[PDB]
Task: inverse folding
């Protein structure tokens, strides 16, 4: 016989039992999301116990099968995922120190309370307190004081845990065939054992700096425009040659620029698209929202979304009788049951993230025929890629005019398209160099060829040249400010929000060369076109079972990144940026410190 | 039931190609190879019995479906189970066929 088919049958049995166990776990997770009670806490404790035990025991049992002896690369990659020992390669004392330090660090991050200004009866958290002093606050001084106090109170509690975290992750990953934990983040973004279309881990690194130096000048021009407009919004503290403070961008970490839209408005007479007026005049509630969603599904070319959502889920607030959270999660039960957690209201951002969540549900049903090791994207960025593609192609009001959602009184002039393109650029393109240097910096931290106790000064001085942001006051090495992030404290793969940011444009070009759509790429309607829908479907139904590079050729046609569609997506905005900040200074200077 | 109707089972392995017109009632273990079961083994015997669950929160491809397969026989004997329903009432003193 051959041990290959023995490993295949072990994979099949493990996949079936994991389907059942993850079905129970996902049902428990959805019931906890809709209701946070004592019995739901017990349900999650038991689900975590059974899931961790089953996963670790099957991973332990999988080590007796040799890995690279199978010519079938599907079950070979299934073994590669299954025979990942992970934290099993080292002993229990380092693991329990890892659990203590990490759970204390997580519960310090989550309810980190800034309590320096005024009386201590208030301590400003993220959503109740920081969101009303960072997203909208017309005082530079109070923003500076609150952000500095927040950074201090995060740093002096997060740093001694994070240094041992970095050391522990490096020595964990050095035994699991990774050069560091950054290499573990690039381990999923690697193709080995498949001939021809090879992808490696440093290849994604050089792709990342390649995309950075490619999309540098668009960020130069939008940085010049946003600096010129923040001369108007925040004068007397920022020089036209120097950089910008990071506590005025609309994002406390310095990441996004989405709420920095009214202060940096292109045209006062023309805002962005707001079709919500006819919705609130239309009594367009969440049920009709999802009916229009399934009509848009049929119009694009996707199949109509199943009734299994409808009797299993809700779309509005349930009141205070049950503890549901309005977090947009597209839960899959793993056994043909789809549920959507979203408080779908009359709000344009809620409708666009409903497009996002139902694109996630569409990609969830796209890999439906695959087993439990393969019911995913080939990387984590594909789900958000499908969601943001759906959101961006749904953000063109021409289809709303065609179907009657938007009345024909509105016209799409150049002003509204500049507003929409600046909204999209400040939303997700404005964090392309931010995500770039945070990913690069966390790589060159976790790789560990660098000195240990100088991270903060170097990190606060290298941000002046990539995005072009300056700390108004110097920050010493007792701080731990980048670990104040949900993707660093919880320590998730932040490359996912980088590379997806190009996905939602490049495949967009792939969905407009098949839609027979011309002109600017942002005005592209994938609806009323079966060819673009089926070309999206071609990448959709592949999923995890193939290496992601292969999917990248059958949707784009390269082993590497189709970067240049970003200019097609933003050509009128780039022209307006050239015409606007030509007289003002374009660039930044490190030495200017407020 | 929400607990799950796990009583129903199926075989994902078999000794050979299952022939038509015969029901292999026994679910005896189909051995993979290269190693003895040494009785009934977890990692290296591969018992073919697997459950369904069939909870009400399953999917359309996972739905419990009730199946009946009716198969006639062409063996050397004519028909016994037919529908002889003709059912016309009566007639009399009329030039008629019957």
Result:
């Amino acid at each position: 016989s051959t041990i290959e088919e023995q490993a295949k049958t072990f994979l099949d049995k493990f996949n079936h039992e994991a389907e059942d166990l993850f079905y129970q776990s996902s049902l428990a997770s959805w019931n906890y999301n809709t209701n946070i009670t004592e019995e739901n806490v017990q349900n999650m404790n038991n689900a975590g116990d059974k899931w961790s035990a089953f996963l670790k025991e099957q991973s332990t049992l999988a080590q007796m099968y040799p890995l690279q002896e199978i010519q079938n690369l599907t079950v070979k990659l299934q073994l590669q995922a299954l025979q990942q020992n992970g934290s099993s390669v080292l002993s229990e004392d380092k693991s329990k120190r890892l659990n203590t330090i990490l759970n204390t660090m997580s519960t310090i991050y989550s309810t980190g309370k800034v309590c320096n200004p005024d009386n201590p009866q208030e301590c400003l958290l993220l959503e109740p307190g920081l969101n009303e002093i960072m997203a909208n606050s017309l005082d530079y001084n109070e923003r500076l004081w609150a952000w500095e106090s927040w950074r201090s109170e995060v740093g002096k509690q997060l740093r001694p845990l994070y240094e041992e975290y970095v050391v522990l992750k490096n020595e964990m990953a050095r035994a699991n065939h990774y050069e560091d934990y950054g290499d573990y983040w690039r381990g999923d973004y690697e193709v080995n054992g498949v001939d021809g279309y090879d992808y490696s881990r440093g290849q994604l690194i050089e792709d990342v700096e390649h995309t950075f130096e490619e999309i540098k000048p668009l960020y130069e021009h939008l940085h010049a425009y946003v600096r010129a407009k923040l001369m108007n919004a925040y004068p007397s503290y920022i020089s036209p040659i120097g950089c910008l403070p990071a506590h005025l961008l609309g994002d406390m970490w310095g990441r996004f620029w989405t709420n920095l839209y009214s202060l940096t408005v292109p045209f006062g007479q023309k805002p962005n698209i707001d079709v919500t007026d006819a919705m609130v005049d239309q009594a367009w509630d969440a049920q009709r929202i999802f009916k229009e969603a399934e009509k848009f599904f049929v119009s694009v070319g996707l199949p109509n979304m199943t009734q299994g959502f409808w009797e299993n889920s809700m779309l509005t607030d349930p009141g205070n009788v049950q503890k549901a959270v309005c977090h947009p999660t597209a839960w899959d039960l793993g056994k043909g049951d789809f549920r959507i957690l979203m408080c779908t209201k009359v709000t344009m951002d809620d409708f666009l993230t409903a497009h996002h969540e139902m694109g996630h549900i569409q990609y969830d049903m796209a890999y439906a025929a695959q087993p439990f090791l393969l019911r995913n994207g080939a990387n984590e960025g594909f789900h958000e890629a499908v969601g943001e593609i759906m959101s961006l192609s749904a953000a063109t009001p021409k289809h709303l005019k065609s179907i009657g959602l938007l009345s024909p009184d509105f016209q799409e002039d150049n002003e509204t398209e500049i507003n929409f393109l600046l909204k999209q650029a400040l939303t997700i393109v404005g964090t392309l160099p931010f995500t770039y240097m945070l990913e690069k910096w966390r790589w060159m931290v976790f790789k560990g060829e660098i000195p240990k106790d100088q991270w903060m000064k170097k990190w606060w001085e290298m941000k002046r040249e990539i995005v072009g942001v300056v700390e108004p006051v110097p920050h010493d090495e007792t701080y731990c400010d980048p670990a104040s992030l949900f993707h660093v404290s919880n320590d998730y793969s932040f490359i996912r929000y980088y590379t997806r940011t190009l996905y939602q444009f490049q495949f967009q070009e792939a969905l407009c060369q098949a839609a027979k759509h011309e002109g600017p790429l942002h005005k592209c309607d994938i609806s009323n076109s079966t060819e673009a829908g089926q070309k999206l479907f071609n990448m959709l139904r592949l999923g995890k079972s193939e290496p992601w590079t292969l999917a990248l050729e059958n949707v784009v046609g390269a082993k590497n990144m189709n970067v240049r569609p970003l200019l097609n997506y933003f050509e009128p905005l780039f022209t307006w940026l050239k015409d606007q900040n030509k007289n003002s200074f374009v660039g930044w200077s490190t030495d200017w410190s407020p | 039931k929400p607990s799950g109707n796990y009583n129903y089972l199926y075989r994902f392995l078999r000794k050979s190609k299952l022939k038509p017109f015969e029901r292999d009632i026994s679910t005896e273990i189909y051995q993979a190879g290269n190693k003895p079961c040494n009785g009934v083994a977890g990692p290296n015997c591969y018992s073919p019995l697997q459950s369904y669950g069939f909870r009400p929160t399953y999917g359309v491809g996972h739905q419990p479906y009730r199946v009946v397969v009716l198969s006639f026989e062409l063996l050397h004997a004519p028909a016994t189970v037919c529908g002889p329903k003709k059912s016309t009432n009566l007639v009399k003193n009329k030039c008629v066929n019957f």
Chain B touches chain A through 20 residues (CB under 8 Å).
